[PDB]
């Protein structure tokens, strides 16, 4: 039972989202993810348009960290805009194996 507090939830979200530097390096949430098996084949199913763009920002990112410069704040990522592009692919790989995992139980 949360309505106004729901609205109150997002601040710390936005706050916590702003408490992690990768926002300030121009990253997103998805590329942050630690690898996994589902992660792997998920990568396969991406179109390049994202994929390449996924690449460059990363490559862009790393370089900056070499030189200890943080992106000029104007250009920091924005809590309003987060791209979930990973997960709609992710649920597939998660799903299907759960079957095999289960359908092979019995």
């Amino acid at each position: 039972a949360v309505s106004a507090s729901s609205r109150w939830l997002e601040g710390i979200r936005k706050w916590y989202y702003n408490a992690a530097g990768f926002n300030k390096l121009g990253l997103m949430r998805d590329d942050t993810i630690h690898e996994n098996d589902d992660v792997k084949e998920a990568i396969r199913r991406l179109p390049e348009n994202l994929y390449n763009d996924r690449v460059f920002r990363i490559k862009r990112a790393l370089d900056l960290s070499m030189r200890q410069q943080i992106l000029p704040k104007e250009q920091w990522t924005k809590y309003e805009e987060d791209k979930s592009y990973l997960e709609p692919y992710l649920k597939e790989v998660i799903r299907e194996r759960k079957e095999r995992e289960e359908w092979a139980k019995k």
Partner: protein, 379 residues
Amino acid sequence: MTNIRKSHPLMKIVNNAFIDLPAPSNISSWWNFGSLLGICLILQILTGLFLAMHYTSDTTTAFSSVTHICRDVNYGWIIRYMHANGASMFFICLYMHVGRGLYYGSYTFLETWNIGVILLLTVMATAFMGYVLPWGQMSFWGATVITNLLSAIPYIGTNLVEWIWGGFSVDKATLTRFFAFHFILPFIIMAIAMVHLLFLHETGSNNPTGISSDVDKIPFHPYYTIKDILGALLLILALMLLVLFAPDLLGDPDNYTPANPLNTPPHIKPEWYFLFAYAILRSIPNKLGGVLALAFSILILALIPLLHTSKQRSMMFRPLSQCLFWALVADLLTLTWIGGQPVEHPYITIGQLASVLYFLLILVLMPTAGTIENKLLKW
């Protein structure tokens, strides 16, 4: 591969485990230790050798000999301290190499981690015996209990202790044995290192961001070699200053008196890193149950990789984890000073206070952290 001089002995093609081993771009001076660790060790072997050259292990001899070393032996004063003080440096070199692993979650590599685990356990006893070798007052009494400690086994311990003794007491053969052990033992480690390393070549090193580095690599030789060279050179003074101007600082053991089984020291402590365990050791009144903890203390390191709780490896992006991380740091250092205290009532409480905290930090807090944070970013 036409006329490459690195083919002719194939051995040089094994060499390209280095010079073309690629590495990510961004690497902190945090990473310079793995290098140093091996280097801190090389020196050990040598100095730890030349000692023996004038050293004699005998109940009557060893002390007077070691006395004689800094006396009549050319530079017997530099060398002994090069050995001992150089030992100390190897520690703090080592822990950071650990600390890096955690704080970025480099432990994610399971086996390589485990090798480090065993690798760690090894090193301690070395120094331990190495510390008994002086046959000083403390060295006698220090091992005396620490060995007597193990008697808490309900059944098989009774024989087994005197067995490792080879006697009813600390007497001669119990010395001599250690010498061999303490002597051979590093070579074993050096071998193990080549295993520990080996897996790493499989998957390569990680980067501070906790992100796949695949897209960007570096030829190892022109660069990280250099930062190591300097990094190596960093070590020099660190020992040089201490070892030369003010020897006795971390030479905290005060006992140059012949070991006296009749006399007992009013204060009994191992040296520092030996204390923080021994601090926990002091805590529990139960003899057996206490030892059980001390064992369990370290080994949970290997457990930690079961605790990967989040979708991002490194802690640089998790404040709370980082908050937690630094929190634990102190809890140890306290115990250090605590174990550096006589067992008066606040300390008594204090250890009891700080003890359960320690695991609690690990065993409860840290896993739940990302769980929230995973949920927080809506991951």
